[PDB]
Amino acid sequence: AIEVKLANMEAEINTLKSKLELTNKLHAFSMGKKSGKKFFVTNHERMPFSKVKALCSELRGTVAIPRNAEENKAIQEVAKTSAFLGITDEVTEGQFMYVTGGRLTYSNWKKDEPNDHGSGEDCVTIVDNGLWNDISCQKKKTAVCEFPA
Amino acid sequence: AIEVKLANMEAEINTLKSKLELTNKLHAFSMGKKSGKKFFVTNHERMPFSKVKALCSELRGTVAIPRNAEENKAIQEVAKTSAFLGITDEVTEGQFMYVTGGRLTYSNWKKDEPNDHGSGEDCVTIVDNGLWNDISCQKKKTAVCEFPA
Amino acid sequence: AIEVKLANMEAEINTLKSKLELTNKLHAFSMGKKSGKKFFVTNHERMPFSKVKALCSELRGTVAIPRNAEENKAIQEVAKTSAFLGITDEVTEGQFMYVTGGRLTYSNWKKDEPNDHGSGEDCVTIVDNGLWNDISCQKKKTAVCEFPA
Numbered sequence: 001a002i003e004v005k006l007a008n009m010e011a012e013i014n015t016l017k018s019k020l021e022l023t024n025k026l027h028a029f030s031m032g033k034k035s036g037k038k039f040f041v042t043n044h045e046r047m048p049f050s051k052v053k054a055l056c057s058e059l060r061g062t063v064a065i066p067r068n069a070e071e072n073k074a075i076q077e078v079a080k081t082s083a084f085l086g087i088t089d090e091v092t093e094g095q096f097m098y099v100t101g102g103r104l105t106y107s108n109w110k111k112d113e114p115n116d117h118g119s120g121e122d123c124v125t126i127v128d129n130g131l132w133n134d135i136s137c138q139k140k141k142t143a144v145c146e147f148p149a
Numbered sequence: 150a151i152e153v154k155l156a157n158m159e160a161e162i163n164t165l166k167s168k169l170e171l172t173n174k175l176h177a178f179s180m181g182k183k184s185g186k187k188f189f190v191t192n193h194e195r196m197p198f199s200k201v202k203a204l205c206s207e208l209r210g211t212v213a214i215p216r217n218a219e220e221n222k223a224i225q226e227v228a229k230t231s232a233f234l235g236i237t238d239e240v241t242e243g244q245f246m247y248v249t250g251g252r253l254t255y256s257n258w259k260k261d262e263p264n265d266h267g268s269g270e271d272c273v274t275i276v277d278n279g280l281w282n283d284i285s286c287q288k289k290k291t292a293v294c295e296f297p298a
Numbered sequence: 299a300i301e302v303k304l305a306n307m308e309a310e311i312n313t314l315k316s317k318l319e320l321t322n323k324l325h326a327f328s329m330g331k332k333s334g335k336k337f338f339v340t341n342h343e344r345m346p347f348s349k350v351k352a353l354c355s356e357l358r359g360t361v362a363i364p365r366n367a368e369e370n371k372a373i374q375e376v377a378k379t380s381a382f383l384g385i386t387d388e389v390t391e392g393q394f395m396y397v398t399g400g401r402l403t404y405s406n407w408k409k410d411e412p413n414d415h416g417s418g419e420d421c422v423t424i425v426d427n428g429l430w431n432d433i434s435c436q437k438k439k440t441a442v443c444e445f446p447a
């Protein structure tokens with residue numbers, strides 16, 4: 001009994017792992033994930049940058065980061081309203097870095113941005129026209145998480 | 150060896166349990182669940198109150214209940230049409246109680262309601278405007294379930 | 299004690315099986331699944347018929363098939379644009395069959411369709427008004443899958 005029951009349970013676990021993987025595939029599909037492309041998801045809730053970071057991390061994702069014009073538009077369509085991007089110059093003023101590390105490979109700043117206006121702006125929002133503007137990380141913007149391709 | 154196989158399998162199970170919980174979190178988020186707020190969801194099907202109660206229970210949820218104006222609006226936008234609420238006055242006419250227990254606190258009655266019209270109306274529906282109207286439980290209204298915050 | 303650990307593992311696995319099924323049920327409900335009815339899902343991605351079939355099959359579903367006017371309207375609403383249906387006359391020109399087997403019964407062909415235009419058209423697409431047209435399986439249309447009732 002012992003060894004047989006153990007061997008079976010191993011098959012039971014393997015079966016459940018496959019089922020859960022398929023469930024995740026179906027869930028990603030319904031969330032709009034295109035084949036071989038990373039995808040963006042939002043609950044349409046507005047919150048400060050720190051809360052967005054924590055939220056996406058818990059979901060094992062990251063704050064949405066556009067690496068090109070296509071992805072920039074994609075985020076825009078998902079968010080619908082101004083949302084935070086996973087880009088800040090919190091570590092060193094003037095040096096915008098990805099929250100995942102590294103300097104920007106792609107940008108789409110509005111004229112005269114980023115300006116660190118007034119009291120300061122260390123976060124980035126993608127406006128309702130695709131251009132970027134740095135804003136206060138304390139302002140409440142739409143939470144948009146990104147998941148791997 | 151057996152003890153090692155067993156320990157290793159317990160580890161796989163814990164990981165799988167954590168992974169499914171993550172799947173649940175991401176799903177709720179994609180469906181609009183806000184931070185620290187109850188999750189309201191509908192399949193847009195209209196049915197009698199008894200079926201709504203049965204359906205939500207099968208999903209391990211309950212018929213949506215607005216505890217305040219904020220939740221009332223949240224349910225209003227998920228339903229979009231007239232939907233049953235988890236409130237009835239079947240025990241003592243005029244005394245509305247939540248299906249999960251307790252006396253009705255927050256209410257948002259429409260003018261001249263509740264009127265227990267005709268043969269009697271013991272269920273409650275949140276109509277398009279967000280206001281409430283008492284209606285026969287046998288009538289078919291949208292099914293909206295609620296899950297914990 | 300080995301046997302005690304084994305029995306707990308079985309209870310852990312069975313609890314996990316039930317929870318995964320609850321997750322699947324809740325996901326179907328959120329996707330608009332009506333009681334005792336099959337449901338449809340789409341990621342809004344356009345691809346050739348062979349790709350759609352492969353995708354749905356991988357998710358344990360099939361390319362959407364309207365068996366009546368109700369299902370047709372439902373698919374039309376999910377798709378939003380022209381999408382492939384799980385119906386083709388690839389095996390024998392002129393005789394449309396469901397990808398899962400059997401000859402086509404209910405149909406909703408547009409005026410003067412099907413016409414196997416030019417070199418040929420063996421796949422079927424549901425257009426914006428809900429009517430059908432036969433087209434090349436090589437063309438890219440929205441991927442819409444159906445899952446069991």
Ligand SMILES: CO[C@@H]1O[C@H](CO)[C@@H](O[C@@H]2O[C@H](CO)[C@H](O)[C@H](O[C@]3(C(=O)O)C[C@H](O)[C@@H](NC(C)=O)[C@H]([C@H](O)[C@H](O)CO)O3)[C@H]2O)[C@H](O[C@@H]2O[C@@H](C)[C@@H](O)[C@@H](O)[C@@H]2O)[C@H]1NC(C)=O
Binds near residue numbers: 262266267268282
């Ligand atoms: C004066 O106050 C208002 O009076 C009207 C009419 O009595 C109420 O609306 C009726 O509500 C009853 C609920 O028991 C029914 O829904 C009536 O509707 C039908 C019906 O019985 O199903 C619709 C049928 O199509 C109709 N038959 C035909 C052949 O047309 C049928 C007959 O006319 C009826 O049997 C004759 O007695 O009537 C409604 O007309 C108002 O109640 C409010 O609105 C309704 C629609 C419900 O939502 C109630 O919960 C509301 O209180 C009532 N309003 C107030 C403020 O008192």
Ligand SMILES: CO[C@@H]1O[C@H](CO)[C@@H](O[C@@H]2O[C@H](CO)[C@H](O)[C@H](O[C@]3(C(=O)O)C[C@H](O)[C@@H](NC(C)=O)[C@H]([C@H](O)[C@H](O)CO)O3)[C@H]2O)[C@H](O[C@@H]2O[C@@H](C)[C@@H](O)[C@@H](O)[C@@H]2O)[C@H]1NC(C)=O
Binds near residue numbers: 415431432433
């Ligand atoms: C009178 O009957 C009607 O005839 C027209 C013209 O042939 C059909 O429309 C064509 O259908 C074919 C189906 O294979 C293609 O969709 C044609 O479209 C293209 C194409 O071949 O992809 C579009 C290309 O952009 C175009 N090329 C350029 C450079 O512009 C190309 C060329 O014109 C063509 O290849 C030259 O050889 O045409 C359609 O024009 C009608 O078919 C029906 O409507 C179309 C749009 C499809 O939905 C078909 O499945 C429909 O049956 C046809 N209608 C009927 C009722 O018989």
Ligand SMILES: CC(=O)N[C@@H]1[C@@H](O[C@@H]2O[C@@H](C)[C@@H](O)[C@@H](O)[C@@H]2O)[C@H](O[C@@H]2O[C@H](CO)[C@H](O)[C@H](O[C@]3(C(=O)O)C[C@H](O)[C@@H](NC(C)=O)[C@H]([C@H](O)[C@H](O)CO)O3)[C@H]2O)[C@@H](CO)O[C@H]1O
Binds near residue numbers: 112115119133
């Ligand atoms: C190109 C440029 O430099 N433009 C300047 C404006 O900044 C641009 O637009 C604003 C809206 C932001 O998007 C910037 O990122 C962008 O560069 C600038 O506008 C002012 O910017 C500051 C940024 O620190 C701020 O957004 C001002 O709005 C608020 C504020 O957040 O501080 C909005 C608050 O709701 C409001 N408070 C209340 C209680 O209503 C405050 C409040 O009025 C001030 O704190 C009072 O001191 O303002 C926004 O106006 C503009 C300002 O002069 O200058 C442009 O050159």
Ligand SMILES: [Ca+2]
Binds near residue numbers: 090
């Ligand atoms: Ca700074």
Ligand SMILES: [Ca+2]
Binds near residue numbers: 120
């Ligand atoms: Ca700055």
Ligand SMILES: [Ca+2]
Binds near residue numbers: 113115116121135
């Ligand atoms: Ca700025």
Ligand SMILES: [Ca+2]
Binds near residue numbers: 238269270
């Ligand atoms: Ca009564």
Ligand SMILES: [Ca+2]
Binds near residue numbers: 243265270271272283
């Ligand atoms: Ca009553």
Ligand SMILES: [Ca+2]
Binds near residue numbers: 264265270282283284
């Ligand atoms: Ca009434």
Ligand SMILES: [Ca+2]
Binds near residue numbers: 387391419420
């Ligand atoms: Ca053919």
Ligand SMILES: [Ca+2]
Binds near residue numbers: 413414415416
């Ligand atoms: Ca012809």
Ligand SMILES: [Ca+2]
Binds near residue numbers: 421
């Ligand atoms: Ca053909």
Ligand SMILES: [Ca+2]
Binds near residue numbers: 411412414431433
């Ligand atoms: Ca045709």
Ligand SMILES: [Cl-]
Binds near residue numbers: 121122137138
């Ligand atoms: Cl800041």
Ligand SMILES: [Cl-]
Binds near residue numbers: 269271285286287
């Ligand atoms: Cl009643």
Ligand SMILES: [Cl-]
Binds near residue numbers: 419421434
């Ligand atoms: Cl073809």
